[PDB]
Design a protein around this motif. Sequence first.
Motif, mmCIF file in Angstrom:
data_model
loop_
_atom_site.group_PDB
_atom_site.id
_atom_site.type_symbol
_atom_site.label_atom_id
_atom_site.label_comp_id
_atom_site.label_asym_id
_atom_site.label_seq_id
_atom_site.Cartn_x
_atom_site.Cartn_y
_atom_site.Cartn_z
ATOM 1 N N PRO A 37 0.803 -1.233 0.000
ATOM 2 C CA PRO A 37 0.000 0.000 0.000
ATOM 3 C C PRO A 37 0.828 1.271 0.000
ATOM 4 O O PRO A 37 0.310 2.327 -0.385
ATOM 5 C CB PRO A 37 -0.833 -0.125 1.282
ATOM 6 C CG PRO A 37 -0.035 -1.030 2.160
ATOM 7 C CD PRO A 37 0.630 -2.009 1.239
ATOM 8 N N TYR A 38 2.094 1.212 0.418
ATOM 9 C CA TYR A 38 2.925 2.408 0.468
ATOM 10 C C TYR A 38 3.264 2.952 -0.912
ATOM 11 O O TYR A 38 3.763 4.078 -1.008
ATOM 12 C CB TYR A 38 4.217 2.134 1.246
ATOM 13 C CG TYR A 38 4.019 1.425 2.570
ATOM 14 C CD1 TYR A 38 4.039 2.133 3.763
ATOM 15 C CD2 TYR A 38 3.838 0.050 2.629
ATOM 16 C CE1 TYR A 38 3.865 1.493 4.976
ATOM 17 C CE2 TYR A 38 3.663 -0.598 3.835
ATOM 18 C CZ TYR A 38 3.679 0.128 5.005
ATOM 19 O OH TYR A 38 3.507 -0.515 6.209
ATOM 20 N N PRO A 47 -3.901 9.554 -1.573
ATOM 21 C CA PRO A 47 -4.843 8.766 -0.761
ATOM 22 C C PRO A 47 -6.306 8.988 -1.104
ATOM 23 O O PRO A 47 -7.170 8.328 -0.509
ATOM 24 C CB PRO A 47 -4.544 9.238 0.676
ATOM 25 C CG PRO A 47 -3.283 10.071 0.581
ATOM 26 C CD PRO A 47 -3.284 10.636 -0.794
ATOM 27 N N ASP A 48 -6.610 9.892 -2.037
ATOM 28 C CA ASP A 48 -8.001 10.254 -2.297
ATOM 29 C C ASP A 48 -8.789 9.090 -2.893
ATOM 30 O O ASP A 48 -9.978 8.928 -2.598
ATOM 31 C CB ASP A 48 -8.065 11.480 -3.205
ATOM 32 C CG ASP A 48 -7.313 11.287 -4.506
ATOM 33 O OD1 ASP A 48 -6.515 10.334 -4.591
ATOM 34 O OD2 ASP A 48 -7.533 12.076 -5.450
ATOM 35 N N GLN A 82 -6.934 5.929 -3.440
ATOM 36 C CA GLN A 82 -6.060 4.790 -3.145
ATOM 37 C C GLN A 82 -5.511 4.184 -4.441
ATOM 38 O O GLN A 82 -5.715 3.007 -4.753
ATOM 39 C CB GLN A 82 -6.772 3.734 -2.290
ATOM 40 C CG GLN A 82 -7.141 4.200 -0.894
ATOM 41 C CD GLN A 82 -5.922 4.384 -0.008
ATOM 42 O OE1 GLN A 82 -5.281 5.435 -0.028
ATOM 43 N NE2 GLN A 82 -5.588 3.357 0.764
ATOM 44 N N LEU A 97 8.575 6.166 0.880
ATOM 45 C CA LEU A 97 8.197 7.013 2.007
ATOM 46 C C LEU A 97 9.140 8.200 2.153
ATOM 47 O O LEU A 97 8.696 9.328 2.395
ATOM 48 C CB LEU A 97 8.167 6.192 3.296
ATOM 49 C CG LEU A 97 7.430 4.854 3.237
ATOM 50 C CD1 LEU A 97 7.484 4.161 4.586
ATOM 51 C CD2 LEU A 97 5.991 5.052 2.792
ATOM 52 N N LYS A 108 -5.685 -1.078 -6.500
ATOM 53 C CA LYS A 108 -5.534 -2.193 -5.572
ATOM 54 C C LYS A 108 -5.421 -3.526 -6.299
ATOM 55 O O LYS A 108 -4.660 -4.400 -5.869
ATOM 56 C CB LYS A 108 -6.707 -2.219 -4.591
ATOM 57 C CG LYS A 108 -6.778 -3.470 -3.729
ATOM 58 C CD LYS A 108 -5.599 -3.551 -2.775
ATOM 59 C CE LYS A 108 -5.796 -2.634 -1.580
ATOM 60 N NZ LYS A 108 -6.818 -3.165 -0.637
#
Lengths: 176, 528, 94, 94
Positions: free
Chosen positions: A25-26, A31-32, A34, A90, A150
């Motif tokens: 997921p990183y 994030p709106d 995904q 990150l 996803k």
Amino acid sequence: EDGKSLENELEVVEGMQFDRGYLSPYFINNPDKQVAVLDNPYILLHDKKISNIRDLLPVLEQVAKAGRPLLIIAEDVEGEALATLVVNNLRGILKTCAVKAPGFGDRRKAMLQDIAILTGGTVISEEVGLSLEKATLEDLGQAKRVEVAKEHTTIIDGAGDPAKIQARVKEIRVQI
Amino acid sequence: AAKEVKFHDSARERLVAGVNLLANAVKTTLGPKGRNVVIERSFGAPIVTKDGVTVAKEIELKDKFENMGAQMVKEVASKTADVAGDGTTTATVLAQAIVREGMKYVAAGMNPMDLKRGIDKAVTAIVEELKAISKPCSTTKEIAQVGTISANADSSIGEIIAQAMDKVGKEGVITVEDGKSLENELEVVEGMQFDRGYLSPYFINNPDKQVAVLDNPYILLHDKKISNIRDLLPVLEQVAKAGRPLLIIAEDVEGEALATLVVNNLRGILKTCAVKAPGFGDRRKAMLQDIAILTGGTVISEEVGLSLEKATLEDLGQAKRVEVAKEHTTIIDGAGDPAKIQARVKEIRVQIEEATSDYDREKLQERVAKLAGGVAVIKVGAATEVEMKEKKARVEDALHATRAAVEEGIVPGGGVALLRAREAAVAKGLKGDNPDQEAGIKIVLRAVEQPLREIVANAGEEPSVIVAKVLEGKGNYGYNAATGEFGDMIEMGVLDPTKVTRSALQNAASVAGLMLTTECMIAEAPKD
Amino acid sequence: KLRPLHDRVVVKRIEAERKTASGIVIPDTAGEKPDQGEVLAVGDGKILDDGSKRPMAVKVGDKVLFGKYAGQTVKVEGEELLVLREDDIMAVIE
Amino acid sequence: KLRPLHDRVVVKRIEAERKTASGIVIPDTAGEKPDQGEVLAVGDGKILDDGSKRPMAVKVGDKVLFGKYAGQTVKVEGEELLVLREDDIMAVIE
Ligand SMILES: Nc1ncnc2c1ncn2[C@@H]1O[C@H](COP(=O)(O)OP(=O)(O)O)[C@@H](O)[C@H]1O
Ligand SMILES: [Mg+2]
């Protein structure tokens, strides 16, 4: 297919979508929704599993020079290789995403070659004579945009010339 | 095997007979004065139910041609239960009415395909009128009224459900389980609780309740087993001089690591507790990240680049208080930034829209409730198991209806909503493209009166007289079958979710419309 | 703090590289442990058969390269230090 | 940069053969790793039992042939430098 509503709906998917999601997921950059959107990224085609860092590091360093994102399409990216990607994501040092190679058996190889032809790159593999350590930017495929959801990614448009794409289409229709 | 083929009326009468047998059994449970149905179980203890879907699912007929009619009507209630959780009896009653009224026009030589098209046209018009009549369910009093009606005039069930939704909010999760007492009780769990206990009784700091309370503790999130001490020591030392307790959430803490924590607990050097990481597989990772976001920390894992030896206090999560019981711990309040928590909730609810399994969004909603809501538990109280199952079904039905009420609104109950919607649709100019389609419209116009007729018939009154009086009235005017009096349905508390009414009509029309278009039926031939 | 004997050399193994030429951060788990380190304490020298001591090729301060097979970690005051014979150090960097 | 000690010799293992006398291209995977390489740094010499140094038979610059079971790779600046004792070199080419 079956619909969820009471009305018929038409969904059109353009370009290359191979219904495979990200491994972490990183990799998501917004994030709106995904999703993992890569703008003008390099595409690395590999027909073998990637687990160690010592082989993928030479090519990961090359894409860092231009700063363009890197999309890694391989059988699996785990262990040190998967770890190295998320640490870089990150920290923002280098944006990248990794997806599983679509298809099983020889069909996986055929569609991997189609992606390479579409994206203007080459499938890095010891069966042809290319090594991941010796892989260069020219061997990598290119696209103007790709988004990794996803459970699927869509290559909006490959960077390969239409002449080779048409020839590849002709070969498949002959095989049909 | 060999197939027996039936044609024309011979096929339709067998189909209709199966419809009537299933619908008549479901009919008996409709309305406040509806009665229970006993279904025998193979393992004993027959179930006593007033739910239409429960009765319908157990009906199978020896005649295979009659069985097709039963099977097709049976899944009218199944679809209504799936999408609304209530109104399965109303859907079954409506489906039988459409079949009964439609077979008259089929026997009259009318084209059944145009009848189906007319039925769809009329149902679309009525559903649109239901949307206009519907009013939002804002007050908690309306929620109690909706729950009371759906629990078969049980005010205790309606009130406890209204309290549960008030406590956990719209984002909360409410479940129903067996109770030990004879009275219904509501248990509300606030914050994050992941139903996992401590690994050692020595972690208990107060023997009065046999619980482990840590005040302002650090939370260590680990996605791998902890067995040795040399890796836990660097973070344990950092926890030690700060004075705050440490809660270790990992897959397992055994051997040297467990002994060291236990040893320091008795000696009082460092107070701590260790709990197993909740969930299995990738779900364990998901909630562990949620705990880290909630507690304002980061899950330590070599898959992300963090190491337990290099873990610092900033990487650890924080909370105001956590209590570890024998089988569960509750984080009273995480220290995470609420903006990040809201963003995390937004991500999960996006995943909720994409969930494909029934347990998928159910656990996803539980994660949302743990993050930005609460979990309410309604323990149903009953003397015996047979009464417990009947009460639980009523509580579950009332929970589904109240959820549908906030989702789409409320309409007057007792079949009034369908009658009011029908009159509005007719007044708006509902017409078909040909006389066969007009008859299909007339099928639905007569069919929507059936829920009120069967409610009144179960109440013992005359359905046709009551229906005529209700049609004479306007607005929320209706008939209270419980008291046998006419009046305002909303004022009298007879409320229905507009989603339940809309779903029942749409599901009934889709199946019963197809049943009108049947000319041939094929079934396996009987074994002589 | 630690005084070796004879041909023993005490080395602090250097940390495995974190950045790269382009700045790519390698996680500590992925980073391979280098076979190099600086010397903190040096022995007098191995006693050869005729007596006296063998002059030592490493002095306290240089960076040395040693095989991964050799060496032993010592637990004094927390730091990891590798104590190994002089013959295992195969090279001296700068 | 790298200075070996005593009998150690630093060798860069030359890459596998690519084009043959007929020009056939061999993939890097198929190409066998040669046991040869040029020497970049040489040690002073092994200290024999009476002191002093053993004269070295390898001088910096020549091509040496070494055993495929001997030597240890060093991670310095990413090169495939191999460090091995003086006795593992079977022979010196030209
Ligand atoms: N006191 C009442 N007076 C009139 N109608 C009522 C009353 N209570 C409930 N009803 C109606 O009876 C219906 C409830 O049917 P029920 O037996 O619960 O089966 P289902 O839930 O499958 O429709 C609702 O549509 C409601 O409008
Ligand atoms: Mg009901």
